Amino acid sequence: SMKILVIGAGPAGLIFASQMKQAQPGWDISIVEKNTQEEVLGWGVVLPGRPPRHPANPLSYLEQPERLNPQYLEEFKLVHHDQPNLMSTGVTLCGVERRGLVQALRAKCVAAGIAISYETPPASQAQLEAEYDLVVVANGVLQLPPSLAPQIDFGRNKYIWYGTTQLFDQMNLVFRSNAQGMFIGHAYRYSDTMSTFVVECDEQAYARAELEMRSERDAAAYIAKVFEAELGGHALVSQPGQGWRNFMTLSRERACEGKFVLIGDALQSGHFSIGHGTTMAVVLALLLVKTLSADTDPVAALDNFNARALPLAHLFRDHANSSRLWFESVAERMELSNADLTASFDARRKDLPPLQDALMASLGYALG
Numbered sequence: 001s002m003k004i005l006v007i008g009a010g011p012a013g014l015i016f017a018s019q020m021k022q023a024q025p026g027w028d029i030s031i032v033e034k035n036t037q038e039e040v041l042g043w044g045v046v047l048p049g050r051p052p053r054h055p056a057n058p059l060s061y062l063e064q065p066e067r068l069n070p071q072y073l074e075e076f077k078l079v080h081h082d083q084p085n086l087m088s089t090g091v092t093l094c095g096v097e098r099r100g101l102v103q104a105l106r107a108k109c110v111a112a113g114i115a116i117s118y119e120t121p122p123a124s125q126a127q128l129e130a131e132y133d134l135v136v137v138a139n140g141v142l143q144l145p146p147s148l149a150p151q152i153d154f155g156r157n158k159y160i161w162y163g164t165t166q167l168f169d170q171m172n173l174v175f176r177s178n179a180q181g182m183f184i185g186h187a188y189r190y191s192d193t194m195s196t197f198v199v200e201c202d203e204q205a206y207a208r209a210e211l212e213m214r215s216e217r218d219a220a221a222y223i224a225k226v227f228e229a230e231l232g233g234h235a236l237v238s239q240p241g242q243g244w245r246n247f248m249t250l251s252r253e254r255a256c257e258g259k260f261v262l263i264g265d266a267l268q269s270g271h272f273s274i275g276h277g278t279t280m281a282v283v284l285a286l287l288l289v290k291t292l293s294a295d296t297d298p299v300a301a302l303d304n305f306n307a308r309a310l311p312l313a314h315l316f317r318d319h320a321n322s323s324r325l326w327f328e329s330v331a332e333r334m335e336l337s338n339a340d341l342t343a344s345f346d347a348r349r350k351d352l353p354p355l356q357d358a359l360m361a362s363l364g365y366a367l368g
């Protein structure tokens with residue numbers, strides 16, 4: 001009935017393509033990827049709940065998720081002035097390698113008859129709307145209708161995504177104050193051997209530590225020294241070309257214009273300090289499939305999607321931004337007790353409508 005093009009072979013468009021073709025096996029679903037097949041950004045990611053019971057976890061859509069060596073975390077460890085504070089997590093946290101997750105999802109799509117072409121060249125907007133009935137934009141953070149234009153915001157802190165062989169058995173959140181400034185580590189094990197170790201700092205700490213001038217090797221050794229107590233001699237490794245950045249929060253005022261509809265980070269990115277990015281890609285992928293299924297008029301489904309997607313994407317943005325800003329000012333909270341800092345941390349999103357209730361409601365509609 002329909003010829004859909006998926007732009008971007010990451011979790012958003014992969015979950016969409018497979019779940020769509022599973023709901024509509026006759027449709028012609030194809031995926032194009034900008035990069036080579038081998039290039040996958042990042043190290044590990046933390047995901048909600050365990051497969052296969054938790055519908056927002058992308059592992060719940062792989063037949064044998066345990067073959068990706070996921071790690072299930074039950075504790076949260078907040079370290080302040082070297083004191084640990086150990087809490088239960090509310091939900092099991094699921095760490096998994098980002099590469100294995102992406103490639104298993106791609107393999108799932110290929111086995112369903114969904115072609116994925118790599119290193120694709122850019123196509124006119126005109127070329128695509130002649131060539132296709134719907135263009136699912138899922139290229140993460142190109143030519144699109146003017147009303148889909150993005151609002152971009154750069155966070156104040158600088159961050160870098162490290163990997164390390166230090167094993168962080170709990171979800172770790174580490175605060176370390178330097179003669180140079182305030183450094184924050186987000187760390188958690190995702191495999192038998194590897195942990196994610198995301199470091200953000202103050203723009204003044206970035207300047208006083210001279211991080212822009214140092215070599216990558218020098219900067220990593222300095223940060224590993226800062227977190228000496230957490231890393232125990234293990235170094236820090238970044239991916240080629242993935243240095244220090246300001247987090248880019250991309251928002252949009254409409255989810256779809258014409259035959260272009262957006263999902264994933266391309267529709268809304270949000271700071272990683274709430275760990276919801278891949279969760280949102282799944283939830284909104286599953287949302288799009290349900291609108292494209294429930295009603296038979298495409299345009300009428302897209303207007304159903306845009307009125308359902310956008311409140312959800314913006315509540316996500318509000319929660320991530322509330323968390324991001326707290327981490328941008330946390331230097332002023334450093335004299336607090338561990339207990340007082342933890343209470344501050346737990347309340348940083350409390351003024352908003354609960355995100356989790358909104359996500360469960362949307363999943364209830366997209367899955368019945």
Ligand SMILES: Cc1cc2nc3c(=O)[nH]c(=O)nc-3n(C[C@H](O)[C@H](O)[C@H](O)COP(=O)(O)OP(=O)(O)OC[C@H]3O[C@@H](n4cnc5c(N)ncnc54)[C@H](O)[C@@H]3O)c2cc1C
Pocket residue numbers: 007008009010011012013032033034035042044045046047120138139140141142159160161198263264265266272275276277278279281
């Ligand atoms: C430091 C950091 C830590 C994070 N930690 C977590 C975490 O713990 N848990 C979590 O769930 N999320 C985490 N995230 C977020 C997570 O990486 C993303 O939110 C998630 O990948 C979004 O999926 P997506 O498919 O929308 O985008 P992407 O994963 O970026 O996929 C988009 C794909 O499209 C491709 N593409 C780009 N442009 C084009 C084009 N023109 N044509 C075709 N293809 C194109 C890209 O190369 C990419 O392969 C983190 C992010 C950062 C930066």
